[PDB]
Design a protein around this ligand. Structure first.
Ligand SMILES: Nc1nc2c(ncn2[C@@H]2O[C@H](COP(=O)(O)OP(=O)(O)OP(=O)(O)O)[C@@H](O)[C@H]2O)c(=O)[nH]1
Ligand SMILES: Nc1nc2c(ncn2[C@@H]2O[C@H](COP(=O)(O)OP(=O)(O)O)[C@@H](O)[C@H]2O)c(=O)[nH]1
Ligand SMILES: Nc1nc2c(ncn2[C@@H]2O[C@H](COP(=O)(O)OP(=O)(O)O)[C@@H](O)[C@H]2O)c(=O)[nH]1
Ligand SMILES: [Mg+2]
Lengths: 443, 54, 17, 34, 433, 51, 432
C-alpha cells in the first residue's frame, strides 16, 4: 500500500517501459490479457504497488506513456505485452520534437503537459498512500529531455513531500548517434539537479560493454539493453513488494545514500549475469555475488570508480541466504579497499535482504553506488558543449524558438558548480573542523 | 533435521543445478535473465540460406 | 490505426480489438 | 580515537568523592598507575 | 498474580517476539490455536478467556506492514489478538526525526490505548519489557517517545530494555551513530534498565560453539528468547531463591546515569560436544566470565565490574553455586571496584531450560544467565562518539533531520550530554585513595 | 567553499512544523486532526457567547 | 587448506602445465568432464589446494594460461583435458612476441598484464590461506621470459609475504633452437634472482638424455618430456595433499634449501624410472631408489655435481616404507661421498616421507639439489651473450622498441657477480 506511479518519456522511455512492465508482469505472474495464473500466494499480497484492479479480476499498470511523435505508440501498443496498458494512458502529440530541446520545453512540449498532468493527477489521487513517482527517459533527444524535465518541474511543484526517482540515459562520447546531443545534455542537468530525489545514470556504451564482455552475445540489440535496464529497475523496489529479513524501500535508500541535496547521481549494476559457456563452471554463492558486483565491468554507467572515491554504497540481495555472510563480505571489502572509500563517513555500505528471488533463479543482488567518479561525465558533456558554443554551431534552432543566449551560459555555470562541489567533497580532510563552529564555546 | 539446515549443508554445492543446464529450460524466463534474446542460435543457418538467396 | 485521432479517421481496426 | 575540541571542555555530571583533595589524589594515583 | 507486559517495537522487536512467544507457548503447553490440550502459571504471560482461549500480553508495534503481515498470515495467526498488532503506513526510513516528530507521534495514542487496556487486566503488575534496536528509525524515535509518554502515564513502574546495541565493525545502515546518540540521550533519563546485546558477538558465539558456519537472525532470536525466559523463570516456576524484576533493577544500577548491563548465557553448546562435556555448576559459571563468551563485543579485562546478577536453572545446588562464586572471587583476572565488596546477586530456579523442535541448543539439565555491569563500555561510547563526531564535522546527513521536525542544537546538546556521560564513567571507575 | 556554505545554510535554518495527524485503526488510517472535531478549535473564536 | 595458484607462461608453459594438470587429475581421480570418479576417501580430503568447487559436484583448476599468440590456446582447449579449465582463465594476446624479450617486456607485455592481474587477484583473494604461486615457463621465448618475469615482479610487489616457485626451462647449447635466445636467457636471470623464492632449472637436452638412455624410447616426444617434468612437479607438493609420517611442504623445503637469498636455483631428479623390457627385472626397494636418485646420469639439468659441491640436498619419498632404511641410506651416501658435499654445513640432507604412492606405482622418490655446479650454465650463457654483444648482434630489434644499451651491461655485471658468489661459496674453508 505504498504506490509507485510510472512515467515513460520518449522512444527510449517507452521501450524501456514496455520491457520493464513485461519483466514485472512475468515476475508477478500476469498474462498479457491481465489476469493472474501463478503458483504462490505471496504474489497477490503486494500487487497494488504497481497494478490497478479492474473488473473481473484484471490488473492494469499504473503507468503513463508520453510522446511527441505518434509512431512510437503504435509499436508500443502492438509490442509483446501491449494489451495490458490502458488506452487512455497513451498521451501522444502529432508533430515530433526533432531532437530539439527548445521544441520539447517551450514550443511543442508546453501544449502537451496540460494534457499529461490531468492523467498524472488522476492516477496519483486514486492511490491509497503514494510512495512516489518514477520516470524513464533519455537526455539525448527532444521528447525525453525537454518535456521530461518540464514534467519533473511541474510534478515537483505540485507534490513536494513525495519521492522522485529518475532513470536517465545520459549520452555517450563514443556511441553518440546524434550531432546535437551536447546542447540537450547540458540544458537538462540543471533541471535534474534541484528537482529530483534520486537519479540513476544509465549509459549505452556501458550496456554494450556488459553485453560484449560479461555476456558475450552475438547481436546485443536494444531488447537486450532494455532487458538489463529493467533488471536494474526491478531490484531497487523489490523490497516494497516482497517480504524479507531486512527491508529497505526508496526512502530508506535515499536517506542513507544522499548526504547533501545536490549529490543524488548514482551508478547501477546487477549481479548474476553469466555467459552461456561459463555457466556450468560457476557456483551461485553470496561471496561470489559480492565479489562480482563491485567489478568495474559490471557498472551500467561509463564512469570508472577507480578514478574517484565511493561516497556511499547500497546493496539489495534477493534469495534464501544468511545474514552473517552478507555482513562479513561488506565489512571485508571496506577493510581491503582502504583508499577507494571516503574517510568522513564510516561504514559507507548499506545492506538489504529480500526472501523471494527472480523467477527461475536461486539468488541475486543489485548494487547502487554514489561515487565521486561521476564528475567526469559532466566534464565531458561540458567540454563538448563549450566546444560547440564557442563557435555558436547549431544555435539558430534553439534561439529562434524562444531562447535567449544567457540560458546556455547559466547551464554551463551550474554544471561547473556541480563538478567543483564534487571535487571539493572528494579532496576533503576528515580529521579537521573549522571556520563555522562556535569558537569552542563555554569553559 | 535441524531447522535452517540447508544454509549450512556441507553438500549444498553438490546438490545444486547450474540454472542453465540446456536451452529448453522451463524455469528460465524473462525475469530470471539467464536466457537472452540476442543469442542467435539460428545465426549460421540464416547466413547459409542468405548465401543461397544471393 | 492506433495513432490517428478519433476525428479524421476512417473505418480501421484498432490493435488487439 | 578522535574528538572535536568543541566537546573537550565539558565536565562530569556525578560527584562521588567526599572532598576535592581526595578526588585529586585518587586521580593522580590512577594517572601514575596508567 | 505477577505479570509483565511485552512491547516489541520495530522489525527487530517483532522478529524477536516471534521466537519468544513460540518459546513461551512450548513452555506452557499452548497449541498454536491458543488452547490447552488447575494450573494457572500461564497468567504471567497469557490471559485466560472463559472458553479456554489464551491471549498473550504483548503489543507488536511497527511502521511497515511487511513483517506484521507475516505474523497475521503464518502459523500463530489464531493466537494473537487482531488489535494487538499495530501497523503504520510509511516506515520511519532510518530517521530519528521521522520516528520522533513526524510519523511516530501519530500512532502513540492508539499504542497507549492498547497498553492501558492490557494494564487494566493486571491484578499485580511488575513492569514493561521493551524489545528494540538502536539503529532503526522506529526503534529509536518511537521507542524514545514511547518511554517519554510511558513515564508520563505511569509513575515509577519498572521499564526493562532488551536493546540491540550497534556493532563496532558491521552494521546495516549509515545513520546509526546519529540514531544511537539521539536514542541514548532520551533513554538516559527515561529508562530504568537497559540490557545491551549486539549481533556480532552472537555471530561469533554461534560460529564457534553451535557449529553453525552460517548463522541467521532466527538463530540469534532463539538465543535472545532463551535469555528472556531465563529472566522470567523466577516468576513462573518455583525455585530456591526468587528474583523479581525490581530486584535486578535495583541491584545493577549504582548511579543515576549508569543503567547499561551486559547479558551472557551458558552453556551454549551442540550435541556432539554435549556428549563429551560434564556440565557442572562450576563449569557453567566459569563460562560466563570468559571474555570470548560475552554477548557484547567489548573486552571486560579493560574495565572493572560494578555488579553481577546470576540466574541458575535446573539440577543445581547452593553449595556448588557458592564454592564456585568463591573461586571466581579468588581468581585474579576478574576485578571489582573497591566500593563494592559484595558484588553478586544469585537466583536459583528448579525447571531446566526447555527445547524447541529444530532448535540449535542441546537438551541440558542445568544452565545459567548473567547480567553484569562493567566499566568496559566506556570504550564503546568512545567509539560511537568517534563515529558521530567524524560524521558531524562536515554536517553530513543533517538536512534530513533538520527539515523534518527538529532543530540543529539538539545534535550539540545530545553530544555534550554523552561527553559528560564518558566523564561520569571514568569518575566511577577511578578507585579511592 | 561548498563545505563551509553547506554548513552555514544548515546552521542558519529552521525546522518544518509538522501538520497534526492521528491514526485510527490497526492498519494505518491517517486523518487530519484540525477539522475532525477532536480538538477545541472553534471555542477559541472571537464571537463566543455574545451576539 | 593451503591453496596454490598455478601460472602458465608461453607455449612451453602451456604444454607442460596441460600435461601436469592431466597427471594430477589422474592422481586425484577426476574424469575429463570434471567430476569425481574415485575409489578412496583420501582423494577428496585435500583437494582445495589445486581445485575450486563449482556447482553440480565439479572441480575446476586454480590455474591461469597466459599467451601472446592465440594458436596455442586452441590446441590446449582441443586437447584431451582441455574442457576442465574455466574459459576465463585463458588470457591471450593477438600479436605475438616473435622470440623478442623487448617486445615481451615493454611493448606487448605492458597491456596484457593489466588483464592478467585481474584474473590473478580474482583467484588469489578467493583462497582462505594462500600458500603461494607456482609458475611454469621457458626463457627461450618472448612471451614466456620477458612478460613472465614482468608478472613475477608485479606479483612480488603485490604479495610480499608469500611463496614464489618457478619451473624455468633455461636453454641448452646443443639443443639450441633459436638464434637470438642468449639475449632472452641473460636478460631474465636478474629478474628471477631479485624476485623468486625457488627456481627449478629444466633442460631439454637433459630430458632427451634421460629418455634416450634410461627409458629407451624410439620416439621421445614432448609428451614424454612433459610427462617427466610433471612427474617431477607433483612430488614436490605431494606432502601438502597426502598424509605421511614426516611432512614437508614448499616453505619447509625452501627454508632448508636456501641458505643465502641469492642462492635459490635447484637441479631436480626423479627415481623409479625404468625401461619396458627391464620392468620385470628390477626390484623396487629403498636402496634402489637411493642409488638411482643420486646418479649423475639422472639430473634434469646440464650440470654435473662431480665438477661442483653439493651445498644442500632434499629428498621426498612416496610410498609405505620404513624410516630406518631411508635414514641409513641417506647417511651412507653422505659418508661415502665425503668430498662431494661441503663441510661448513653438517647434516646437508632433508628427508620427507609421504604415504600414498603414485598411481600404478609402489614406491617413488624426488630429489632437489642446491649445488655449485649450476654456475657453469650461467657461465656458458654469459660467454655466448658477450660473444654476440661484442659485435652487436641483433641489437636493432632490442633498441628500436625502447631499450637503452646499459641494460645489457648491467645484465652482464649482475650475472658475473652471481657466478662470482657461487665461486666464493665453492672455495669456502671449514675454519678461518
Ligand atoms: N538481533 C537482531 N537484530 C536485528 C534483527 N533484525 C534487525 N535487527 C537490527 O535492526 C537494525 C535496523 O533496524 P530494523 O530493526 O531493521 O528496522 P526498524 O527498527 O523498524 O527501523 P526502520 O526500518 O527505519 O523503521 C539493524 O542494525 C539490525 O542489527 C534481528 O532479527 N535480530
Ligand atoms: N538504452 C536504450 N537507449 C536507446 C533506446 N532507444 C534509443 N536509445 C538512445 O537514445 C538516443 C536517442 O534518444 P531518443 O530515443 O530519440 O529520445 P526521444 O527523442 O525522447 O525519443 C540514441 O542515441 C539511442 O542510442 C533504447 O531502447 N534503449
Ligand atoms: N621441455 C619442453 N620444452 C619445450 C616444450 N615446448 C617447447 N619447448 C622448448 O621451448 C623453445 C621454444 O619456446 P617458445 O614456444 O618460443 O616459448 P614462448 O615464446 O614463451 O611461447 C624450444 O626451443 C623448445 O625446445 C615442451 O613441451 N617441453
Ligand atoms: Mg523498518
Amino acid at each position: 500500500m505504498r504506490e509507485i506511479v510510472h512515467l515513460q518519456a520518449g522512444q527510449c522511455g517507452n521501450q524501456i517501459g514496455a520491457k520493464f512492465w513485461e519483466v514485472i508482469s512475468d515476475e508477478h505472474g500476469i498474462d498479457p490479457t491481465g489476469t493472474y495464473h501463478g503458483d504462490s500466494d505471496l504474489q497477490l499480497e503486494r500487487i497494488n504497488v504497481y497494478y490497478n484492479e479492474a473488473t473481473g479480476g484484471k490488473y492494469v499498470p499504473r503507468a503513463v506513456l508520453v510522446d511527441l511523435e505518434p509512431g512510437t505508440m503504435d509499436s508500443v501498443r502492438s509490442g509483446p505485452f501491449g494489451q495490458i496498458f490502458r488506452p487512455d494512458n497513451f498521451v501522444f502529440g502529432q508533430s515530433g520534437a526533432g531532437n530539439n530541446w527548445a521544441k520539447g520545453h517551450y514550443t511543442e512540449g508546453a501544449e502537451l503537459v496540460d494534457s499529461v498532468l490531468d492523467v498524472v493527477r488522476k492516477e496519483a489521487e486514486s492511490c491509497d498512500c503514494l510512495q512516489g513517482f518514477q520516470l524513464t527517459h533519455s537526455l539525448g533527444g527532444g521528447t525525453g529531455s525537454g518535456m521530461g524535465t518540464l514534467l519533473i518541474s511541474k510534478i515537483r511543484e505540485e507534490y513536494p513531500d513525495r519521492i522522485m526517482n529518475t532513470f536517465s540515459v545520459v549520452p555517450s562520447p563514443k556511441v553518440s548517434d546524434t550531432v546535437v546531443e551536447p546542447y540537450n545534455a547540458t540544458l537538462s542537468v540543471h533541471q535534474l539537479v534541484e528537482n529530483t530525489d534520486e537519479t540513476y545514470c544509465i549509459d549505452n556504451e556501458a550496456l554494450y560493454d556488459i553485453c560484449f564482455r560479461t555476456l558475450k552475445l552475438t547481436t546485443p540489440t536494444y531488447g537486450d539493453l532494455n532487458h538489463l535496464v529493467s533488471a536494474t529497475m526491478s531490484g531497487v523496489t523489490t523490497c516494497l513488494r516482497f517480504p524479507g529479513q531486512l527491508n529497505a524501500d526508496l526512502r530508506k535508500l535515499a536517506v542513507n545514500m544522499v548526504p547533501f541535496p545536490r549529490l543524488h547521481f548514482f551508478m547501477p549494476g546487477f549481479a548474476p549475469l553469466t555467459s552461456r559457456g561459463s555457466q556450468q563452471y560457476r557456483a551461485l554463492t553470496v561471496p561470489e555475488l559480492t565479489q562480482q558486483m563491485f567489478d568495474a565491468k559490471n557498472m551500467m554507467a561509463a564512469c570508472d570508480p577507480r578514478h574517484g572515491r565511493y561516497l556511499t554504497v547500497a546493496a539489495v540481495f534477493r534469495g534464501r541466504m544468511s545474514m552473517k555472510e552478507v555482513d562479513e563480505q561488506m565489512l571485508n571489502v571496506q577493510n581491503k579497499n582502504s583508499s577507494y572509500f571516503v574517510e568522513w563517513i564510516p561504514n559507507n555500505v548499506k545492506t538489504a535482504v529480500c526472501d523471494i528471488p527472480p523467477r527461475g533463479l536461486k539468488m541475486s543482488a543489485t548494487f547502487i553506488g554514489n561515487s565521486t567518479a561521476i564528475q567526469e561525465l559532466f566534464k565531458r558533456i561540458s567540454e563538448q558543449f563549450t566546444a560547440m558554443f564557442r563557435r555558436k554551431a547549431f544555435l539558430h534552432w534553439y534561439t529562434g524558438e524562444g531562447m535567449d543566449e544567457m540560458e546556455f551560459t547559466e547551464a554551463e555555470s551550474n554544471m561547473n558548480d556541480l563538478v567543483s562541489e564534487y571535487q571539493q567533497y572528494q579532496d576533503a580532510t576528515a580529521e579537521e573542523e573549522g571556520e563555522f563552529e562556535e569558537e569552542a564555546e563555554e569553559e | 533435521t535441524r531447522r535452517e539446515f540447508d544454509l549450512s549443508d556441507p553438500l549444498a554445492l553438490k546438490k545444486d543445478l547450474p540454472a542453465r543446464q540446456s536451452d529448453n529450460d522451463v524455469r528460465n524466463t524473462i525475469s530470471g535473465m539467464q536466457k537472452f534474446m540476442g543469442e542467435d542460435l539460428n545465426f549460421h543457418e540464416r547466413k547459409k540460406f542468405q548465401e543461397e538467396q544471393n | 490505426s492506433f495513432s490517428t485521432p478519433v476525428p479524421l479517421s476512417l473505418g480501421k481496426l484498432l490493435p488487439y480489438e | 580515537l578522535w574528538h572535536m575540541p568543541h566537546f573537550q571542555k565539558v565536565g562530569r555530571h556525578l560527584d562521588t568523592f567526599p572532598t576535592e583533595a581526595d578526588r585529586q589524589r585518587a586521580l593522580k594515583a590512577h594517572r601514575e598507575e596508567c | 498474580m505477577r505479570e509483565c507486559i511485552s512491547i516489541h517495537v520495530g522489525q527487530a522487536g517483532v522478529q524477536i517476539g516471534n521466537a519468544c512467544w513460540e518459546l513461551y507457548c512450548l513452555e506452557h503447553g499452548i497449541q498454536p490455536d491458543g488452547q490447552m490440550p488447575g494450573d494457572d502459571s500461564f497468567n504471567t504471560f497469557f490471559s485466560e478467556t472463559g472458553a479456554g482461549k489464551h491471549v498473550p500480553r504483548a503489543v507488536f508495534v511497527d511502521l511497515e506492514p511487511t513483517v506484521i503481515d507475516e505474523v497475521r498470515t503464518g502459523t500463530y495467526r489464531q493466537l494473537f489478538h487482531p488489535e494487538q498488532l499495530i501497523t503504520g503506513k510509511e516506515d520511519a526510513a532510518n530517521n530519528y526525526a521521522r520516528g520522533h516528530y513526524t510519523i511516530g507521534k501519530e500512532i502513540i495514542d492508539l499504542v497507549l490505548d492498547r497498553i492501558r487496556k492490557l494494564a487494566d487486566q493486571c491484578t499485580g503488575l511488575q513492569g514493561f519489557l521493551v524489545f528494540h534496536s538502536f539503529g532503526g528509525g522506529t526503534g529509536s524515535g518511537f521507542t524514545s517517545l514511547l518511554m517519554e509518554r510511558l513515564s508520563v502515564d505511569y509513575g515509577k513502574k519498572s521499564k526493562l530494555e532488551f536493546s540491540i546495541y550497534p556493532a563496532p565493525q558491521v552494521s546495516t545502515a549509515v545513520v546509526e551513530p546519529y540514531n544511537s546518540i539521539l536514542t541514548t540521550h532520551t533513554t538516559l533519563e527515561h529508562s530504568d534498565c537497559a540490557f545491551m546485546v549486539d549481533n556480532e558477538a552472537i555471530y561469533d558465539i554461534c560460529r564457534r560453539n553451535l557449529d553453525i558456519e552460517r548463522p541467521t537472525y532466527t538463530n540469534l532470536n532463539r538465543l535472545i528468547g532463551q535469555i528472556v525466559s531465563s529472566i522470567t523463570a523466577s516468576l513462573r516456576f518455583d525455585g530456591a531463591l526468587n528474583v523479581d524484576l525490581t530486584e535486578f533493577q535495583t541491584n545493577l544500577v549504582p548511579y543515576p546515569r549508569i543503567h547499561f548491563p551486559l547479558a551472557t548465557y551458558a552453556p551454549v553448546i551442540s550435541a556432539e560436544k554435549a556428549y563429551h562435556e560434564q556440565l557442572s555448576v562450576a563449569e557453567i559459571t566459569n563460562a560466563c566470565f570468559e571474555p570470548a563468551n560475552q554477548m557484547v563485543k567489548c573486552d571486560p579485562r579493560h574495565g572493572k565490574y560494578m555488579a553481577c546478577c546470576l540466574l541458575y536453572r535446573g539440577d543445581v545446588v547452593p553449595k556448588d553455586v557458592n564454592a564456585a562464586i568463591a573461586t571466581i572471587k579468588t581468581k585474579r583476572t576478574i576485578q571489582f571496584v573497591d566500593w563494592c565488596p559484595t558484588g553478586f546477586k544469585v537466583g536459583i530456579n528448579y525447571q531446566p531450560p526447555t527445547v524447541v523442535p529444530g532448535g540449535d541448543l542441546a537438551k541440558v539439565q542445568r544452565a545459567v544467565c548473567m547480567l553484569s555491569n562493567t566499566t568496559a563500555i566506556a570504550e564503546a561510547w568512545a567509539r560511537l562518539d568517534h563515529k558521530f563526531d567524524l560524521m558531524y564535522a562536515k554536517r553530513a546527513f543533517v538536512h534530513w533531520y533538520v527539515g523534518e521536525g527538529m532543530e540543529e542544537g539538539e545534535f550539540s546538546e545530545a553530544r555534550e550530554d554523552m561527553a559528560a556521560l564518558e566523564k561520569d564513567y571514568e569518575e566511577v571507575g577511578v578507585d579511592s585513595v | 567553499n561548498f563545505i563551509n556554505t553547506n554548513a552555514a545554510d544548515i546552521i542558519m535554518g529552521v525546522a518544518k512544523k509538522p501538520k497534526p495527524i492521528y491514526v485510527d485503526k490497526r492498519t494505518g488510517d491517517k486523518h487530519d486532526l484540525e477539522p475532525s472535531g477532536l480538538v477545541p478549535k472553534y471555542i477559541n473564536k472571537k464571537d463566543y457567547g455574545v451576539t
